[PDB]
Each structure stands twice: as C-alpha cells, then as structure tokens.
Amino acid sequence: SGVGHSTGNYNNRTEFYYHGDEVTIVCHSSRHIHLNMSESEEYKIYDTDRGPRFPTDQTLQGRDTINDSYHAQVETPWFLINPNSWGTWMNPADFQQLTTTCREVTLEHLDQTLDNIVIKTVSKQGSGAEETTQYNNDLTALLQVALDKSNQLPWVADNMYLDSLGYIPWRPCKLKQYSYHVNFWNTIDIISGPQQNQWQQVKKEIRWDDLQFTPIETTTEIDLLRTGDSWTSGPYKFNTKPTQLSYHWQSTRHTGSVHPTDPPNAIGQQGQNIRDINGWQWGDRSDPMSAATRVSNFHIGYSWPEWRIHYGSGGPAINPGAPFSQAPWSTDPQVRLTQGASEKAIFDYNHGDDDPAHRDQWWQNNLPITGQTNWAPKNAHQANLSSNVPSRQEFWTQDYHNTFGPFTAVDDVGIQYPWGAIWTKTPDTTHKPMMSAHAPFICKDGPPGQLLVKLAPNYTENLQTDGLGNNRIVTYATFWWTGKLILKGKLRLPRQFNLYNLPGRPRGTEAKKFLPNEIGHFELPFMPGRCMPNYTM
Amino acid sequence: SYHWQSTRHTGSVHPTDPPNAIGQQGQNIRDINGWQWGDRSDPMSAAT
C-alpha cells in the first residue's frame, strides 16, 4: 500500500447460481466517478422561483397550477453516490436471464467500496491568449467520505430526477449535489374568487421558527482519504418482501367458477350460456342469472379519482391510484390514455439515451397488466340489484369514487428495468403504507447507505482575503466505486402447455437501437420486470 | 414528535441552481431527466 499501488480491482459482471428452486444472483458493478471541487464550502438555505410554466394570470383559471416547482431546500456541499436503480447493477442481457428464470426475487444484501483515489489541481499558465493549462496531481490532498448507517440524515436518495450511477459500465459517472427540503408552506387556492374560477396563493413562505437543519459534519463520522487509501462500507443486509416477476391478467370476471355453458358443436358456433342455473347472486336475482352479478369472495382492482391533485401544505401534489393497462379501453392508437397510473421516464446520455445534449423518453403504460384495470368514469352504481332493471333514476354513471376497500386485491408496478429505483425509505408514521407506487422493495428497517463524498478544500496562501478574489485552489478528483448486491430468486418453471412469450425488447423497437453506433451511442431497452402471465388465483 | 413533511417535502429535491447573493431566489432548472407521471416532458415539475 502506498502512492504507487492500486487499491482495488475493477469488477463489473453478474453471475447466477441455480440450486433447486433457489437462484442466487450476485451482480457486481464498478464505476469511474469524476468529482469536482464543491461549488461553495458552506450550507445554504433558500427557496426557489415558482417554476417553469406556472401561470402568472387566471386565463387558464388555475389549471396550470399543477405545474409547480416551488420548494425550499438546504444544499450541503456534499455529493451523493447512490446505486439505487436497476441497470446500475445489470446489463440488458443479464436482466433478461433474471426475468426469464426467476418467478420472484428478493434483495439479499449490499456491499460497496471506494478506491484508487486520484486528486489533481489545474494550474493556468500564460497570458490568457495562449492559456496553457497544466494538470498536476496533489498527492497529499484529501477526499472525505461520509456514510450514515444510522439513517440520521434526510434520505432523499431515490431515482426521481434520476440521480444515480450511470447504466453502461465504461462511461464516467458524475455526481449530483446532496440537498433536502426544509418545511415551507406553498398552499394554493384554486377555488378562490367569485364563481370560484380564480386561483390564488394562500400562504407561500419558508417557515423558519419551526425548521430543522442537520449538517453532515455533526451527524456522522467522516473518513479522510489520501491517494493510497480506500474505503469499504461493510455489509448491509436487507429485510424486505419479494416482488412477483409475472403479471396478472385476471379480473374478477376471470377469477372464479365459470358460468355454465354448453359447448359448441362445430368450428363456427359460439358457446351457449345456460338459462336456468342454481348459483349464488347478490341482490334478488333469479331469472337473470349472470356472471356479472355472481357473488365472489374478493374484488380485483379499485377505482380512484384518477390523477387526483392533492394541494397539500408544501404544494400541489398528485395521489397515484392503482397501476393498470388502458389497453382494453385503448381503441384508436392516436390518443394516449394515461389513466392507468402510468409513469414516464426522461433520461440522459449516461442513463441510456443515445444522443448527447438531448433527452429520450419512454412512458411505460403497463400494457401487460389487465384485470386490475378500472377506469373510474366507466363504472356505475345502482340503488337495488333485483330481477328488475332500474330506471333512469337510481343509476349513476360518472361518480369517480375511490372503491378501495377490505375486499380488494391489487398489484404494485414491479421492477422497471433501466430507470426504476430498487428500494425505498419507509416513512415512520402510524400505519406505514401497504405498498409502494414505484420502488418495488420497501425497507422495513432503515434503507442502505446514502453515501456522501466531498472533496476537501485546498486553500491558497491567504485565507478569507475576499476582495474579488478566489479563496481556494481549483481541484478535482477521480475515483472508482465498486459494489455488489446479492439477490435471491425462485426458479420459474412452465405452468402451461403452450409456448410462453418470453422477455425481450419492447414491441415497437428494433434491435439496431440498443446496440452501439458508429460513434458508440446506444440506448438501453426498457424491460417490464413483470414479464409473463400468471394465474392470480 | 410531529411530522411536518408532506409528499412535496419528502423526496428528492427538484434540481435548482443556487442564488448568487442575499437577495436572489433559487432558480429551477428547466430541462431535467427525471421521472414523472403521465406524458410529461417539457413541464418537468416537482408537483408531478
């Protein structure tokens, strides 16, 4: 160990281990991280402009207020390394092998290191027309590393805004600066004014008297690393429940016993429903025995006031509703039906876009998941269910009610390969949430890590001189991050006679994408992660 | 203890470049690569 010895090797690959029903996935990952001298060396607390596209006038009468970026934050001078994403860990072929051969999968445990620290200082030379730059490495400079295993810091580490290590192994990764929210009141009234067509800002402010500011320095112990030094996090063990890798097509009309039918005679005929049968029903039902009114033990899916905007303290937010496909109600392709709690992923060059300085999009609409599909407008309710058919009164078509209840069974989205976050923080409240709208894994104990790195400052000869001067020496670092997280799957075996339709690239896509270009530009394919049909019950 | 965070206070923070002096406001970045809900591209916003 010393200046001239490399501290750790590069390993990025995954290998699978099959024994019996168990399959162990050990996915290594390694990244080359480029770190810049922190912008300012101090903690800052400030709020922001309202945002882009927020209305200045009432012409659209408050509907634009759904575009609100206003927030108040504290930005630390620390940079966040998180490996929370699928595709940081696995390339497309190895996620395919996972998704075909595994029925469900868990997180086993995580381990990660930092090493091969290199710190350089740029030195300008010349008159500025020549402007010769020189890159000298400072052997005694420090890089300082904070990891909170106690989760004392605000968590704020997930892919929303996609701050994560790059997906393809051979490109350099660039960190984003750590920051978290402080309490503020953004409340907006969209009912304001006569006729209730006006929107108004009720109270928009940063609340100071109740506020909590936690620096990295007082919270956790910080390791200081020279060039020959390395850092290891130690083991982190998950405890979470598995996620299903198969999608459910059954609604409550597909689930139960089948309506009595006599078979068709020849290839042209249709099945024929038996008129008089002895089964259970709901209301007074006798003459009209029908599979719609068959009593069932459970119901699959629930209605929601789809795209509910919350308008809580802190701003307008959105309350997801259940994921499902609009494909049954899809009809014409031109129009795009978002109502299935669909999600859209913007992404950049390092995150799997082919073109630099442009951002490709995806928008998963969850087409495979059906039978959970409930579009709120389509539903109805009646006063009475009887052998008689109600009148125009007693029948209500467009309520938009929340029908979630004790009888409902639903599915989470599952893992969304390239851009989806792996895990999440469990909010500590009475009645923890039942399931997550995005991240497939909930951490019952604290989530892993939240690793923070800052480049210690290099000050010039004179300190706090100010006077239109710069305080410290321009510096940057490059170091190598390596980690492995282990997965436990359960072997998938054929449950059907006919051929399955196996995982692969999305339907509209060709294979010339997803492969390197003449320049080396390529896109990573979306993989559903809930990839195959399975009987719900 | 009481919880002050809504779902707008909870998660990752919208990308912002800092203010320069004591009078200025933070400035929200126009073009960012994050997740959204419906088809959202041009209007990347912390609400959605």
Added chain:
Amino acid sequence: SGVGHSTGNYNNRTEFYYHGDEVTIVCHSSRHIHLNMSESEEYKIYDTDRGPRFPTDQTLQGRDTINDSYHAQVETPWFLINPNSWGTWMNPADFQQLTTTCREVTLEHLDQTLDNIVIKTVSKQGSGAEETTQYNNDLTALLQVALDKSNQLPWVADNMYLDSLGYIPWRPCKLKQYSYHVNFWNTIDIISGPQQNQWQQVKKEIRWDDLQFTPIETTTEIDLLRTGDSWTSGPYKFNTKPTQLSYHWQSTRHTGSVHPTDPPNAIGQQGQNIRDINGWQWGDRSDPMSAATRVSNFHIGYSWPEWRIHYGSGGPAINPGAPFSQAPWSTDPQVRLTQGASEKAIFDYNHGDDDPAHRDQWWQNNLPITGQTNWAPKNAHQANLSSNVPSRQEFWTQDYHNTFGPFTAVDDVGIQYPWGAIWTKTPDTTHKPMMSAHAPFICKDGPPGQLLVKLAPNYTENLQTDGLGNNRIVTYATFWWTGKLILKGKLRLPRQFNLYNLPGRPRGTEAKKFLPNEIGHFELPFMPGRCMPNYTM
C-alpha cells in the same frame, strides 16, 4: 503510513450517556487549520502606543484614561491552538440537550491530536502583469509542534480577545500568534495637579533590569512533523469543582421563614401581615416586627464600588464585583444599566457573526440572576436599629462600600455558551482566589495544554544575504486538529409542579437568525448556561 495515507479521520459530534443520576457527555471536535509562514523568525520584545481613545489633553480630566491599551510584550514566532471555549466543542442543539438534562457538570478529561499535515510553497511566475502563481507542496518540509504539559510557559490562553478555534465545524480556522507580557510600569496619576483635576503619567516604562524572557525552544521539547506524521497530546485529566446549571432567584428576603400572614378571603384581597408576633429581630425591635429586620443566618450578595478602576502597576484595570441582574431596578428599557457586573462579547465571522468584515455584539446582562442583586447606591446604613426611626442624621444613603464578608453567599456567572472560556489558570499566590469572574472552571493543578505550532522555515539558496532581499521561501500549511473532552453531569429532574420554562434562543431573537442564509451566513445563539430557577436554600 506514508505520503499517500491519511493519518486521521474527521469526527465532530457529541453523544450523551445516561445512567442513573450520572450523564456522560463526550464531545468530539475537529477543525481544519490554515497556517502561514511565521512573520519573523525571531523573538521580539517591545512596548506599544498608549492606545485608541486615550486622552492627549485634560479636557475630560483623566476620565478617558480608563481607555488604556499600553503594554509591553514579547512576541514569539509561534501560533497558539487553544480549544478553550464553549462552542468550539458543542453546537447549539447539543448545548441545549446538556443544559436541560443536567443539573450541574464537571470537566472529566481532554485529549487532542494533529494530523493530515499539508505544506505548500507558493511560486510566482511571469512578468508581474500576468503574475501567474503556482502552488507546489513540499513533501519534505516540516511543521513543528510544542506542547508544555509542565506549564512552564506563561499561560495567556483564554478567550479574552477570543483567540480560539472557530465555532462552526465546516469553516477553516486561523491561528493567532503567541505572545505574553513582560513587566512594565504604566502607573497613571488621576489626582495630579492643583484641584486634583489633572491626570499625569507617573512612570511609563518597560523594566529591563528585572525581566524574564522564556523561549519555546529552551522550555519544552519540540516535535517535528513531515506530511505522513501525526501528533497526539496524550490524556489530560482535570480536577475541578462542578458548576451549577441553574440560576438562583432568592435574595435574603426570599430565603428564610415567612412573615406570619393571615390568608386573603377572596380573589381580590391581599394577604395581611400579623401585627404582633414573637420572632427574633436585630436591634431593639418590638412594636415594629418586620421581615426586613428579621435576623437571618446568612446574607446573599454583596455591594461593591461598582466599576472600580484599579490603577495598579501596569495600568488602569477594573475590579469586577459580583454578577447580578439589573432587571429589578430596570424600569425604562431605553437606558442600559451595566452595573450588575455585566459582560459584553464582541465576535467575528468564524466565531458566530453572520456578516463578514463586521463584528456583531451581545452583552450578557445576566437577567435571570436576581436576589444576588445589590446596587451600591441604593443601600443605606443607620447608627442604631431600634423601635424608633432615626433622624436625618444617623442615616447615610450613598456610601458605595464593599459589603463582602464572612456571612455572604454569592454565585459565579456560570458558563456562557458561544464565547465563554471553559477553564482557567489558578494564579499561584498565598490565598488563591475563591471563585472566578468569568471562566466557570478553575484548574487546581495546572491547566491543560497550551499547544503551540510553528511552520519551520524554508530558506533559499543563500542565507543571511540581506540587502533588500527575502531570506526564506514563502510557505504555508494546512492541518487537521481533533480533540475530545468528556464531561460528567448530574441528571436534572423536576422539582416543581408547574411547567418549567426550558432553554432556548434569547427572547428578543427570532429563529431566522441562527440558521444559514442564502449565502450560508448565520449567527450562533447565546445560551445562558445557568438556565433554570432553583431554590438557593
């Protein structure tokens, strides 16, 4: 260990340990110190100008002479590191947790280190219009460290002038140069001249024939440190008596048995003092039995010729008197009554001022402490205490006497959080002082430390060439100081039925101060350190 290995980690946080009545506070602290090449490499002995605002004329007839900065010193080329202050060790929230949960606290022991030495040499380049500077680190340069555990050096390490490590953890700290007084005679006569309205300098000189000059080199052993080297002080154990964390509101009128009173009948009425009672008194007292003349065993507080100016050898000084609040005599707010032995703390950006190049102020007036309050002018004495009331003669209103005596009980100021010094040197004299005017802890044995660092000189090719040249190479260093001192407290439990009024920010202050700004500027709050009422007896 070597050039490319960091010698020690950054830890700045405190953690508390509660077992039974004992509470152990272990407060770590770590600082990044910026060290400049010493101004001159030699010891200098000189005296100074009289000072700013000292009178050149007798217009104010000697009253300005209270402004006297004149002194004679010897400045060593050494820089002093002292962690003697509250707020070097603790942030506001952790001093609050100390102050609420602890009844009293002691110093247990101190330990401190230096490591991650970085020494650079600045090299100018170009014609001076371009003036390109280059920062090269000299791997073989030395930083030399002296610590006297024997206290052979003049102590001179306390916060008066606030030479101490910065309070907030993430800013760099800059050392002040070590120096100490040599004997001189400043004596000033304010009684001079006919009518005794003239001030005159009796004898102002540096006394050479009796003088003592102690260098650092001959006094103590000096450690020399390259980059890969580190330094540890070893353990230092305090022996001192505890300090109360609660304030006493009782005077001698609040202390004893209560004057017999029959209760009031309804919500409007006042208590009624019994006319004829059998108690003790002082002089001949019979008909006028009164709580004022009740004999008591002790007396609380003492009078003093408040703001006594000493005018000893070496200059006019000031002899403190006892700390107390002027709030009972406060009346109108506009006027500011200083007479309670109040103290004022100037402070700078690194010491908790928000604005750079400006110095915020505080002035603790000790408002909570009452019942010790004695304003000298207000008092009086009589010839006889009898049932009769004396005449205009025999009664003397404005004496200003010192009433300290064998019967008096008093309080020290206590700990003053941001700017107050933790400990102090015990002057070695017959009859050591009873209690300290500022620092809460007296060191019965020697005080800790007094750590001194100098940056060893880097000489150019030719030595002692002089001739309008510079002797040595421009150099500076940055290194990391870490230390922990442990405290032993005693658990505080409720002694009352009603709610206490718990520690927090000062009354006039809001919470937008004390929190980082958009630039990151914030102020640390004053905390009283004697925070809650308690029965004196």
